[PDB]
Symmetry: C3
Subunit: 247 residues, 3 copies
């Protein structure tokens, strides 16, 4: 197991927690892999109906941690594995956004089923054009779907944040808790307090039955997207440009 990311179960809630606020929860390849496996884990567990993903500090995650060298063949394997696990996960994926997210970790927020926000200073940022890359983590599908093509084009092409006012206008954030971003702990605990309230009286196997159908609406497109995003990425690595621009 891993000291940047913890997890526990709590009735129907399998809870994953990024516990490295000092480093703005930047994640390395093996961290993304681990995160992928925790989902595989919650997904086998027959008592779990909701995978909640929380973080810490002032950022949800600043994304990739930057510290023949086909280290990029791991970078790529990273993308595929973790993106696959989200796309396919059958439990209801909930993300507690305690601050900005960037890069692949931002793409993963966009694959979650429900998102809640600590306050209105949150944003998602996809700096691909800036690092001479293209879309990853299913964003080809996930961004236009959840924010619209024209907004997606404005943000991706010109490396601009999908800010909070955009998130509400498109219903991306299912609720804002409007709390200090000093206290991520209380926000994460407030969310789970309410989740515990909302599930009372429900028949949870219905939720999974319902996700099973809703998921079918785009599952093929999500997978197609993951596949072709990776293929086309290689054209960009072999050119070399991404590397020069890691500085």
């Amino acid at each position: 197991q891993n000291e940047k990311i913890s997890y526990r179960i709590e009735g129907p809630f399998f809870i994953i927690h990024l516990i490295n606020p000092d480093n703005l929860n930047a994640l390395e390849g093996e961290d993304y892999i681990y995160l992928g496996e925790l989902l595989e884990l919650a997904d086998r567990n027959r008592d779990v109906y909701f995978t909640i993903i929380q973080s810490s500090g002032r950022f949800f995650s600043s994304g990739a941690d930057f510290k023949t060298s086909k280290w990029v063949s791991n970078f790529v394997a990273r993308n595929v594995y973790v993106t696959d696990a989200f796309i396919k996960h059958s439990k209801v994926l909930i993300c507690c956004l305690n601050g900005p997210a960037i890069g692949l970790s931002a793409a993963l927020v966009a694959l979650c089923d429900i998102v809640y926000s600590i306050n209105d200073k949150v944003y998602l940022l996809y700096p691909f054009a800036n690092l001479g890359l293209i879309t990853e983590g299913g964003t080809t599908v996930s961004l236009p779907l959840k924010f619209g093509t024209n907004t997606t084009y404005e943000c991706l092409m010109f490396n601009k944040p999908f800010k909070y006012d955009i998130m509400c206008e498109n219903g991306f954030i299912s609720k804002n808790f409007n709390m200090p971003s000093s206290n991520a702990e209380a926000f994460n605990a407030k969310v789970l307090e309410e989740l515990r309230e909302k599930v009372k009286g429900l028949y949870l196997p219905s939720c999974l039955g319902m996700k099973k159908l809703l998921k079918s609406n785009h599952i093929d497109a999500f997978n197609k997207a993951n596949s072709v995003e990776v293929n086309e990425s290689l054209k960009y690595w072999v050119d070399g440009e991404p590397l020069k621009r890691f500085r």
Copy 2:
């Protein structure tokens, strides 16, 4: 014919009216069937270009009326038939929302082409998780399409209303008449007054031509949805849980 639901024709407008406000226009299986047949009716009638669906009282409809017992094989046959008729209907479907709608009658509001609202206290509610069921009436497709996946997940998974402020933010309501919900009669009559204004000067066969193309965008998905929703539902009935939870 049937004493819970009336209808008349009025130039291009085939008007269907739920006329049972005392019982908050709850509908039984045969009522949904009848409603399905009235659409088949308007759909054959070559003078009709708009099927308007109005109700009465303080509710548009509270949905299913609850009053070897394979009565559920009728419940199921109900869903399939009436959902089919909406999906396939070729006239422009307009719904005059005089108050909340619940359940299948709420799903049918989501299949209508245009919706108008009496005032800002209207809502749609889909209590499937609460009755140990899954999605029905094409909601698998219709909700994410018209409100977005993240909002759909928040409302369905946790049995919460799609309230009015959500409906505007997603353009679901094409106009609010902002009238007392004492007077549904005047609201229904105001809507038809305006509809009569708006059609003047138009070439109505163009409207049907245009719906024919727009409809093609999701017709397969709607049908796939109706089919698999029903199949998967049976897994839930045979378990029994829906029944225990009718109390």
Copy 3:
């Protein structure tokens, strides 16, 4: 070359300009064709990454210029060619909306990737029902996608504008410059000033790589749409009604 529409290149920006404000930039068939060819042009040019489309005066365009007569077989050939060129264009399409757009020129605004507006008095209008026609310029796909089915039905069926407040609520306008619509010149120049700012530091081949993937999400539907819109249109011409209603 053509005296109603100019163009120049300026680093990565291929700029097309409708320069006939006196006639509210109404366009004839051969004008739409030319516009189609300018795109084919920018699309071959390997130094170009953005095709910017600007206009002049108080209108972006009032659409079709109205001034055995199978002149309609040219009307139709017009639609197909120019709609094809937009659908398929691989450079990032940006449209600077200096005032209202109508008809096919409005449909082409809806095919652009990004749109900016001079001020909040802009609108798009699709008067097809009014001229006994159906959808053209891919609007069958483009309108519901970018504004939603219910709003699309309200505007098309009843010949009403997609006004500015609707455009923001659906993220259609990626930024409003809030300037006098006296001065279109300054607005067009302000847009290009900012575009020049935003591209600095980026790796432009990433933008085209990203559009290549995003475009794939609906390219088949757009093409299907162009094809069947044309086929079904002929049923309406042969009836004659469009012609009677050109007065």
